[PDB]
Amino acid sequence: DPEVTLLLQCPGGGLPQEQIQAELSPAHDRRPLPGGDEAITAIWETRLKAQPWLFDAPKFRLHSATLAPIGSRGPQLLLRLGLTSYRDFLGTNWSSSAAWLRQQGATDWGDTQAYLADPLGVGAALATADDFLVFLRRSRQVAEAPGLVDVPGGHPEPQDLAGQLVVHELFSSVLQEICDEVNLPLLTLSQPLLLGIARNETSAGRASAEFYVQCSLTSEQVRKHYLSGGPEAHESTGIFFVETQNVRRLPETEMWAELCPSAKGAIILYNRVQGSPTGAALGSPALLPPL
Numbered sequence: 001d002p003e004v005t006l007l008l009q010c011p012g013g014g015l016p017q018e019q020i021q022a023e024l025s026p027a028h029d030r031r032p033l034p035g036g037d038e039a040i041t042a043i044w045e046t047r048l049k050a051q052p053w054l055f056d057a058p059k060f061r062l063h064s065a066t067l068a069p070i071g072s073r074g075p076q077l078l079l080r081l082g083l084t085s086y087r088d089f090l091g092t093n094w095s096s097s098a099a100w101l102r103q104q105g106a107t108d109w110g111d112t113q114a115y116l117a118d119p120l121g122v123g124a125a126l127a128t129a130d131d132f133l134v135f136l137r138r139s140r141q142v143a144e145a146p147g148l149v150d151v152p153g154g155h156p157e158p159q160d161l162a163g164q165l166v167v168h169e170l171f172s173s174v175l176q177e178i179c180d181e182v183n184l185p186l187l188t189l190s191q192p193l194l195l196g197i198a199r200n201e202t203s204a205g206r207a208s209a210e211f212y213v214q215c216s217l218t219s220e221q222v223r224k225h226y227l228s229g230g231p232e233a234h235e236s237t238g239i240f241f242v243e244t245q246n247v248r249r250l251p252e253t254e255m256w257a258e259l260c261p262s263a264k265g266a267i268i269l270y271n272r273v274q275g276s277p278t279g280a281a282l283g284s285p286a287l288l289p290p291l
């Protein structure tokens with residue numbers, strides 16, 4: 001799967017909010033482009049002159065993520081974050097010349113990402129009370145991955161001492177994306193666990209944090225809530241469900257070719273971190289069938 005690379009696999013079946021630190025620093029920002037940020041401004045002007053109802057928004061930038069020695073006490077992960085924007089994204093990661101920016105970043109800074117916006121995405125493996133994962137079909141009319149399968153998520157917007165509020169907004173935002181797109185009540189959702197971070201190589205290496213969330217509703221009740229919003233309550237064009245039993249072999253199915261890269265990241269991390277049992281009981285042949 002060349003369009004997705006794992007940057008982080010979390011320990012202990014995934015990390016809660018209280019075990020994560022963030023360091024939000026201008027040292028974690030994108031570097032100015034070699035010929036100046038005028039190139040980003042030019043692309044933006046052209047876009048507004050065709051679609052003048054577009055607006056910029058601030059985003060978190062992922063610089064890097066360091067895991068503690070496994071089995072240690074104290075904070076288990078440090079996220080190094082800067083700030084970027086939707087405008088910076090359209091001028092860098094989305095640019096036709098994004099591969100040239102990666103090569104220049106290797107040359108100038110020994111970092112393929114130094115000249116890229118790299119806005120941080122969030123995504124969820126959302127499980128139902130009757131043990132299914134939730135999938136959404138993308139409209140065929142949008143710019144990115146038209147007509148492909150996705151999982152719930154989005155790109156959160158800003159506003160360990162500022163750090164702890166930043167971790168809280170990341171965890172909060174994945175629940176809010178589920179309530180906005182799936183139309184579920186907040187009180188039916190567990191606190192998220194971070195599974196890991198996956199990079200989209202079809203979008204010049206921008207990264208998504210992938211979380212596990214458990215819902216107290218069955219698949220039938222989730223479908224009712226989603227549909228009862230009507231066509232205007234969601235950006236997706238349909239919802240569907242796969243048994244957690246069958247998610248194990250999803251990369252061998254015809255569905256795999258229809259999954260967008262960030263949804264592939266979510267399913268790979270779910271399989272490695274929530275699946276793949278380590279103990280004698282769940283590991284026994286009748287409960288973990290070979291092949």
Ligand SMILES: N#Cc1ccc(Cn2cnc3ccccc32)cc1
Pocket residue numbers: 059085086089119143144155
């Ligand atoms: N920062 C950031 C960010 C990154 C990707 C996307 C999804 N996406 C992809 N292409 C798009 C064009 C227009 C609108 C949204 C779009 C949204 C925000």
